[PDB]
């Protein structure tokens, strides 16, 4: 809570196109982009890196020492964006992160709250953008029900 939450309906195939649009329309100080698996993190990161994004990635198939080095460098602004999975962002507080992108929508309310909390800093407005496929509809409802909140559609200006 403390962050504005939006969603857009997309297909899996269209997600990178959507990401490119978001990163061409939003004001991103730093962002964290969440995916649902290590393989998907690494593939996405290599791909957007080739296209000129500034990004590091973190996931499960790394040593903790390495993840700690990448987080440290990310906090120091050596890259603008971090692509990562859930398991390892526990307790990370980087004040500059003003945008969280759920590139893959999570399956659980607990995970959802942990993720979007990464863009919420006291005295700073944050934004969470959720890419929702047809297959994510039941989990979107469950999560909205549990939190007692409505995730609004992306504004027209995007």
């Amino acid at each position: 809570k403390g962050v504005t939450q939006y969603y857009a309906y997309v297909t899996e195939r269209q997600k990178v196109h959507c990401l490119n649009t978001l990163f061409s329309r939003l004001q991103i100080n730093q962002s964290i982009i969440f995916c649902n698996s290590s393989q998907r993190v690494e593939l996405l990161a290599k791909k957007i890196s080739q296209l000129g994004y500034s990004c590091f990635y973190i996931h499960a198939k790394m040593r903790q020492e390495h993840r700690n080095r990448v987080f440290h460098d990310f906090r120091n602004g050596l890259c603008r964006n971090l692509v990562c999975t859930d398991l390892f962002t526990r307790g990370i507080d980087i004040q500059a992160v003003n945008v969280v992108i759920n590139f893959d929508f999570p399956k659980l309310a607990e995970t959802y709250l942990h993720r979007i909390g990464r863009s919420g800093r006291f005295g700073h407005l944050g934004l969470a953008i959720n890419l929702i496929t047809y297959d994510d509809r039941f989990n979107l409802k469950s999560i909205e029900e549990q939190l007692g909140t409505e995730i609004k559609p992306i504004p027209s200006n995007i």
Binding site: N20, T21, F23, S24, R25, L26, Q27, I28, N29, G52, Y53, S54, G77, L78, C79, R80, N81, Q95, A96, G123
Partner: protein
């Protein structure tokens, strides 16, 4: 046009020290001379104003682009946006506008004083701003004193404008007079104390004058808060 604005936003969203040279080349490939005014407005209004953690980055970007006409545009836009905020209706609760003004002040110092370039009185008369704020009351001082501090923070990083530069010290001595005032808020006295420390100055070695007692001077200032 919208396609080119998108590319510009993408570039600033993905700018880092390590890709700076490459992103500058891409920006030059993208932004034709006729687009540079829009880019200057975008940089100041949408980035610098709310991304103070990347002020060094964006300052370094200007040094790398090496376009003096663009630099002039950016400075003019910085002053313009400062003035929009200086002439606004002031409320303590408007934390957002106060922060925007502080950030623009921080940036202003970084692209003038920290580069050994003056803040010209024709653009912004900093001493007079303080005196006017005093006249107009605590709500104006709440915006203006932290703004001036963020500007002057840069002076210590200037071989030209570091203390005891007379322009810098004239402002510091007015801040010293304000610091004496019975009803200046303790938070603002602290702002002045922190500025002194940031400038390696002892507040007690400053020389407050009698400008705040000069009611004719105060009544006749060239107004900057309207």
């Amino acid at each position: 046009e919208e396609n080119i604005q998108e590319k510009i936003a993408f570039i600033f969203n993905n700018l880092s020290q390590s890709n700076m040279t490459q992103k500058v080349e891409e920006l030059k490939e993208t932004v034709k001379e006729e687009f540079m005014p829009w880019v200057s407005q975008y940089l100041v209004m949408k980035r610098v104003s709310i991304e103070p953690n990347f002020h060094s980055l964006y300052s370094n970007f200007l040094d790398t682009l090496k376009n003096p006409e663009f630099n002039k545009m950016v400075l003019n836009e910085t002053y313009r946006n400062i003035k929009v905020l200086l002439t606004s209706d002031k409320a303590a609760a408007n934390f957002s506008d106060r922060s925007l003004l502080k950030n623009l002040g921080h940036w202003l110092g970084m692209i003038t004083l920290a580069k050994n370039k003056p803040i010209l009185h024709t653009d912004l008369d900093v001493k007079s701003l303080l005196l006017e704020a005093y006249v107009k009351g605590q709500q104006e001082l709440l915006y203006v004193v932290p703004f001036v501090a963020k500007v002057l923070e840069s002076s210590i990083r200037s071989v030209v404008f570091r203390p005891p530069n007379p322009w810098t010290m004239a402002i510091m001595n007015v801040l010293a007079e304000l610091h004496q005032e019975h009803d200046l808020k303790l938070n603002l006295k602290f702002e002045i104390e922190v500025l002194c420390k940031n400038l390696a100055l002892d507040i007690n070695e400053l020389k407050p004058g009698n400008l705040l007692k000069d009611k004719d001077r105060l009544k006749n200032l060239d107004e900057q808060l309207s």
